[PDB]
Amino acid sequence: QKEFHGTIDYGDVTVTGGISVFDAKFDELYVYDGDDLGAVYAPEETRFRLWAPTASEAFVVLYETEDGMPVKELPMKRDVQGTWTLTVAEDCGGLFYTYRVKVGEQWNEAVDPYAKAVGVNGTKTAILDLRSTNPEGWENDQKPPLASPTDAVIYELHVRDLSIHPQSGIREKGKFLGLTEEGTRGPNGIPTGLDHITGLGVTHVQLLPIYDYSQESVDESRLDEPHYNWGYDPQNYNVPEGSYSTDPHNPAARILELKRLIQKLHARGLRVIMDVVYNHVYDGYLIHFTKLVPGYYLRYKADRTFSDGTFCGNECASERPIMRKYIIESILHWVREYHIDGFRFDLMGMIDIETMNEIRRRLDEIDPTILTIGEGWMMETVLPKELRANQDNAEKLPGIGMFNDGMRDAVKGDIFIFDRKGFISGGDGFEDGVKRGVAGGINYGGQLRQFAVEPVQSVNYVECHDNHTLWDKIELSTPGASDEERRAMHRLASAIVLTSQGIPFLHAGQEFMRTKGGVENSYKSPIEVNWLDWERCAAHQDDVSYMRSLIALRKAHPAFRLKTADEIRAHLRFEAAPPHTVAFTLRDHAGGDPDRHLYVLYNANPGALSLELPALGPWEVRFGGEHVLALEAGARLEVRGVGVVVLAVPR
Ligand SMILES: OC[C@H]1O[C@@H]2O[C@H]3[C@H](O)[C@@H](O)[C@@H](O[C@H]4[C@H](O)[C@@H](O)[C@@H](O[C@H]5[C@H](O)[C@@H](O)[C@@H](O[C@H]6[C@H](O)[C@@H](O)[C@@H](O[C@H]7[C@H](O)[C@@H](O)[C@@H](O[C@H]8[C@H](O)[C@@H](O)[C@@H](O[C@H]1[C@H](O)[C@H]2O)O[C@@H]8CO)O[C@@H]7CO)O[C@@H]6CO)O[C@@H]5CO)O[C@@H]4CO)O[C@@H]3CO
Ligand SMILES: OC[C@H]1O[C@@H]2O[C@H]3[C@H](O)[C@@H](O)[C@@H](O[C@H]4[C@H](O)[C@@H](O)[C@@H](O[C@H]5[C@H](O)[C@@H](O)[C@@H](O[C@H]6[C@H](O)[C@@H](O)[C@@H](O[C@H]7[C@H](O)[C@@H](O)[C@@H](O[C@H]8[C@H](O)[C@@H](O)[C@@H](O[C@H]1[C@H](O)[C@H]2O)O[C@@H]8CO)O[C@@H]7CO)O[C@@H]6CO)O[C@@H]5CO)O[C@@H]4CO)O[C@@H]3CO
Ligand SMILES: OC[C@H]1O[C@@H]2O[C@H]3[C@H](O)[C@@H](O)[C@@H](O[C@H]4[C@H](O)[C@@H](O)[C@@H](O[C@H]5[C@H](O)[C@@H](O)[C@@H](O[C@H]6[C@H](O)[C@@H](O)[C@@H](O[C@H]7[C@H](O)[C@@H](O)[C@@H](O[C@H]8[C@H](O)[C@@H](O)[C@@H](O[C@H]1[C@H](O)[C@H]2O)O[C@@H]8CO)O[C@@H]7CO)O[C@@H]6CO)O[C@@H]5CO)O[C@@H]4CO)O[C@@H]3CO
Ligand SMILES: [Ca+2]
Ligand SMILES: [Ca+2]
Ligand SMILES: [Cl-]
Ligand SMILES: [Cl-]
């Protein structure tokens, strides 16, 4: 992130037999396989293990307070496969620690990469009995059922956005605990917070970064002054973010309160997906990895400069054995310690395929219903192309979902050309792009094919935290339209997401046409840009009810949720349809649907049309009757107006 006022020393190579940390032969040395990296606290002793093969000396530095002076500095013993060990024979509860190493001529001090608790702003590791952080009844925590990734409805949310608006009616504004408060009310008495979210019928809340991110993003010691950040600046991967706790200065508070949040979501029928950012760290020069083992954990070009394919300054070297181990053990920590139900991998194309498949394999051993989705964008890096976990390699990543950007841009228009129209806004030639997404991105037939082998690999969305909101994109691409016409386009885009095969994904506030005032990239914009505006929600309760009704329609019809590509190819049929419309049927009780056949019309044409319907039986209106002038029994549909219509032939 910043200019480093200092030196990186890559080591005295005599320590490693003349083999440099950059050499390809280095990877086969020092591959520790134990499960005890970090510190293990017991009442009579704490055991430390540090992986630092290039260091000539290593110490545990003990502190009594989070901002105090060292009270003890103990040398560690060189142990197996590049590690250092130390047992401190005292009760270390309540203490803090760092490691100090000598690498080359430099002495460096760093937080434990395997930290499970930290002091304020994450500058020291906190020693802690994590069992003391478990909520009452945590042992009885039970997940809501989930039969298929296609049965999930994901709701993407930032912990600060949720509650920081002054009329949210939530007491612990901006905190994990704000999402545990039930019966909260907003303007005109509307439900807000948790009750609003459960009322929508979504199944998964995907939380923007809840791991500990950098002080430059949010200073945890100055929370009495304005602050906001998405948090894509990782500092401590295995501990929660301090600013979402009621007391950033109490190491246990953030841990207990996140567990209480997850417990409450599960009890209210919601699963939790964690946004994880293993592709980069906040600052490649200052991160603990670089202080402890410089040159290993991050990717370097041949000329020994950082590979910067993330556009964040650095990339994590996920393909090197000890970093692969780190990432896997981190994910398993969040699953085992925090009962997390899924992961969304930021810039997944920066992670190697072997690592991603091992993650998916290890999670399947625990619970196959844990979700794994990610940004599988094709992006350049020093990591060879055939190893990148992106769309081009999706056939090598079974069971991992990827955001379907092809569908996104077909529906609402190019996200990088703000004024360019798409299907909903009357652009020409987007119908096949919408059809490709309807089919869940699979190889459906003809030119209707995308990257997915199976529909569980395709996450459908028209809004997320990145880029303009759907409302703001519609505004920029429809300068000649009225706001009433724009609201109809907005509703159509949401209907396309929720009636397409694959995994539907909604951005928090999409239900009330969330706006950021035209801000394209709001990662550090103030709360007035980023909050969930509960006043707008109160003015848009009909639109909220429409989203709720779309979610209910998808739940009522398993034909929208087919689990396999073979079923989609057997049951989904596209019908002849005029420009600026798409029409399809889901035939023969698809996926166990109660109705014999469904017909779905996506109508982006504002005028009156008479459409031919397939002769499959006595059609009746199930959704979108506000657009239907008549249903003629040679069957025909008389429609007017932009929106979705769903018909059914009953059993
Ligand atoms: O003197 C040789 C020795 O020097 C160095 O060790 C120093 C170390 O670096 C310092 O940190 C400190 O050690 C203190 C330690 O950190 C504290 O934790 C505590 O140690 C207690 C242990 O925590 C506790 O578990 C128990 O220890 C018992 C062992 O668990 C048990 O296995 C057995 O130990 C026997 C060994 O298994 C056996 O191999 C053999 O040990 C020899 C080592 O293999 C050999 O390398 C060398 O050790 C070096 C060491 O590598 C340096 O880092 O010689 C050892 C033989 O003397 O024999 C062991 C049996 O004696 O039994 C032990 C004892 O019950 O209890 C201890 C507390 O007793 O306190 C430590 C200091 O009090 O200082 C040491 C140097 O003083
Ligand atoms: O450069 C830093 C960059 O970081 C952030 O971008 C993130 C972005 O917000 C996320 O959405 C995602 O991006 C991925 C995207 O979602 C995927 O779809 C795919 O992108 C492909 C497009 O789908 C595809 O259409 C095509 O894109 C072409 C454009 O349509 C075309 O317009 C042109 O793009 C030019 C832009 O019009 C022009 O503005 C300029 O772009 C600059 C941006 O203006 C500037 O803000 C910044 O971008 C940020 C971004 O704001 C962050 O949010 O730098 C840009 C410098 O170029 O120039 C463009 C010239 O290329 O051409 C493109 C390419 O032909 O192909 C793309 C590529 O596959 O993958 C995206 C990730 O690569 O993640 C990113 C990264 O975090
Ligand atoms: O409460 C939210 C709602 O409030 C306002 O609507 C009022 C409306 O303006 C008044 O006219 C009156 O409504 C009565 C109506 O006049 C009567 O005709 C009857 O309605 C029956 C229908 O005639 C009958 O066809 C059937 O309706 C079915 C539809 O045909 C079928 O399409 C589907 O309906 C779904 C919608 O298509 C879909 O859009 C979505 O509806 C949501 C709206 O989009 C959203 O704006 C909001 O609606 C507001 C509305 O804008 C206000 O003007 O919430 C809606 C519900 O989520 O989802 C629908 C459900 O799937 O299915 C329906 C039902 O099977 O039956 C109905 C009822 O018997 O009675 C109406 C009174 O109940 O008053 C309403 C407010 O009460
Ligand atoms: Ca932090
Ligand atoms: Ca699977
Ligand atoms: Cl805060
Ligand atoms: Cl690529």
Side-chain angles (χ1 to χ4, degrees), residues 165-182:
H165 188 281
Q167 303 310 317
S168 72
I170 292 161
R171 169 164 304 281
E172 294 291 336
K173 295 190 161 54
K175 308 294 188 178
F176 291 138
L177 287 189
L179 190 47
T180 72
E181 291 173 35
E182 306 172 280

Side-chain angles (χ1 to χ4, degrees), residues 349-350 376-381 383-386 388 390-393:
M350 293 284 121
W377 317 132
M378 270 71 68
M379 300 170 70
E380 204 55 42
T381 166
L383 182 73
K385 183 177 170 76
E386 74 275 7
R388 298 164 192 172
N390 59 35
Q391 290 170 2
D392 274 2
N393 298 322

Side-chain angles (χ1 to χ4, degrees), residues 39 69 237 240 245 287 291 395 408 434 477 502:
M69 302 301 304
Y237 279 120
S245 77
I287 195 67
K291 293 195 272 180
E395 74 282 352
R408 173 204 72 207
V434 177
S477 52

Side-chain angles (χ1 to χ4, degrees), residues 160 173-175 223 227 243:
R160 191 158 175 72
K173 295 190 161 54
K175 308 294 188 178
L223 298 183
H227 55 280
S243 68

Side-chain angles (χ1 to χ4, degrees), residues 311-508:
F311 308 122
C312 299
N314 65 81
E315 310 167 23
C316 290
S318 66
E319 80 278 8
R320 301 190 77 171
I322 296 306
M323 181 53 136
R324 171 172 303 133
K325 174 191 178 65
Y326 183 90
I327 292 161
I328 289 159
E329 286 176 357
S330 178
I331 284 149
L332 297 176
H333 169 70
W334 288 103
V335 169
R336 289 169 182 155
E337 186 74 39
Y338 291 90
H339 301 182
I340 293 290
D341 307 295
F343 297 92
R344 170 260 191 211
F345 288 83
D346 189 72
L347 298 188
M348 190 172 64
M350 293 284 121
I351 301 166
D352 68 291
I353 285 172
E354 187 174 340
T355 298
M356 289 309 307
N357 284 331
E358 185 64 9
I359 290 161
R360 179 72 270 177
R361 188 186 70 70
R362 292 294 304 278
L363 289 176
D364 281 349
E365 295 179 335
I366 293 174
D367 191 341
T369 72
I370 293 170
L371 279 183
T372 53
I373 70 175
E375 286 185 300
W377 317 132
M378 270 71 68
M379 300 170 70
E380 204 55 42
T381 166
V382 297
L383 182 73
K385 183 177 170 76
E386 74 275 7
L387 305 181
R388 298 164 192 172
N390 59 35
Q391 290 170 2
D392 274 2
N393 298 322
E395 74 282 352
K396 299 185 172 312
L397 298 154
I400 299 174
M402 310 206 273
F403 288 94
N404 187 338
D405 54 323
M407 176 62 145
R408 173 204 72 207
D409 286 349
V411 169
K412 68 168 167 178
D414 201 321
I415 58 157
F416 299 118
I417 302 180
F418 306 152
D419 66 346
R420 189 70 54 88
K421 295 171 162 64
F423 174 76
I424 65 182
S425 35
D428 294 335
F430 297 99
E431 295 86 3
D432 282 356
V434 177
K435 295 181 191 180
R436 274 183 284 275
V438 164
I442 67 165
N443 183 2
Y444 176 81
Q447 284 187 285
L448 300 188
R449 59 177 304 163
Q450 295 189 254
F451 57 83
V453 175
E454 300 291 338
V456 301
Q457 293 185 290
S458 179
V459 177
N460 295 313
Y461 72 126
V462 291
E463 184 173 310
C464 75
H465 70 274
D466 282 311
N467 307 293
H468 290 106
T469 76
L470 173 65
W471 180 259
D472 289 353
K473 166 69 190 177
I474 291 170
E475 179 204 75
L476 292 163
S477 52
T478 61
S482 72
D483 278 326
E484 200 76 351
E485 295 164 346
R486 290 177 180 151
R487 289 192 276 273
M489 301 175 183
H490 195 283
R491 283 190 172 200
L492 175 58
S494 295
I496 292 169
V497 169
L498 283 156
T499 55
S500 293
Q501 307 291 324
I503 307 177
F505 179 107
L506 309 172
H507 183 233

